[PDB]
Design a protein around this ligand. Sequence first.
Ligand SMILES: CCNC(=O)OC[C@H]1O[C@@H](n2cnc3c(=O)[nH]c(N)nc32)[C@H](O)[C@@H]1O
Ligand SMILES: [Cl-]
Lengths: 112, 115
Amino acid sequence: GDTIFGKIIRKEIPAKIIFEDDRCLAFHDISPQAPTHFLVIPKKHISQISVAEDDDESLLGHLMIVGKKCAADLGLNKGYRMVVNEGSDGGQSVYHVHLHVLGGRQMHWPPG
Amino acid sequence: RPGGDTIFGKIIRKEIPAKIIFEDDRCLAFHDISPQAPTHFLVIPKKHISQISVAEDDDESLLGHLMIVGKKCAADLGLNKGYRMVVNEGSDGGQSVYHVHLHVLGGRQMHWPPG
Ligand SMILES: CCNC(=O)OC[C@H]1O[C@@H](n2cnc3c(=O)[nH]c(N)nc32)[C@H](O)[C@@H]1O
Ligand SMILES: [Cl-]
């Protein structure tokens, strides 16, 4: 099934895009939990990390490399936190794999 | 020494004990000594990378491998209701060990924001 992130990838609804390539998209989160809070998502519709395949390893690592590069470009020189949520206990909100990147404030422990 | 001399490098080389869940040629999964959830483990590369901000472009497959191993271990540990994966970078990220690592937490409802 389609999700709102599919609509964002397809440019059907607006989002504040930070970076795009042939295989992923980074954009600011509409409900930010830190002064900087963006998402990096694959264009391939993987519904959740628990169903990713071995062949997806490069793509998943690409989300993290893009995420760390965007974080540097956004001036997060004091650090940041990356989060992937899975399922109900993980608090996953959209069933399209997404990497949260949060910074601009002290992130606390435990991480939720 | 291969893996460096952070606590995680020592664990990689079996010089400090740990409760190991999974091991392959690229990574190691082991339980966190100060768990923040009923299940809380770490997946780390055997290659020493100090922090995600300095990872190289050719580290992509290895970083993704941490997540695939993390999700496989979570399933093998019975985290059928889900889990949260976390990478901490630097001071604002709460990083305390400068060897790249993926936290996996579950067995309870995780809250938002994630710290
Ligand atoms: C605070 C989160 N930011 C961070 O950088 O997390 C690093 C994580 O490494 C864990 N840890 C430290 N020493 C040891 C050790 O000897 N053994 C084990 N099995 N885990 C350890 C620590 O509890 C923390 O959650
Ligand atoms: Cl989520």
